[PDB]
Amino acid sequence: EAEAEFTDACVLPAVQGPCRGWEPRWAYSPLLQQCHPFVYGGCEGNGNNFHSRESCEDACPVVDHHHHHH
Numbered sequence: 001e002a003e004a005e006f007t008d009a010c011v012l013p014a015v016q017g018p019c020r021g022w023e024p025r026w027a028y029s030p031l032l033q034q035c036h037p038f039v040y041g042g043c044e045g046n047g048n049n050f051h052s053r054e055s056c057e058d059a060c061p062v063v064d065h066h067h068h069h070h
Contacts, residue, residue, distance in 0.1 A: 009047030
């Protein structure tokens with residue numbers, strides 16, 4: 001896959017939650033191999049919730065593809 005192959009929260013899609021307030025957060029997308037902003041709800045959600053572009057890529061960074069995988 002990517003070099004990140006262990007399913008960390010960053011590999012997991014993000015969620016808003018049952019709330020109705022809209023809190024901007026950042027989430028990593030392995031399908032985009034990058035982080036993007038998203039609408040979050042400030043209540044229950046998944047762990048793929050970052051404070052910035054920075055913190056998100058810092059959690060799941062890109063490195064040169066020293067393919068340990070196929």
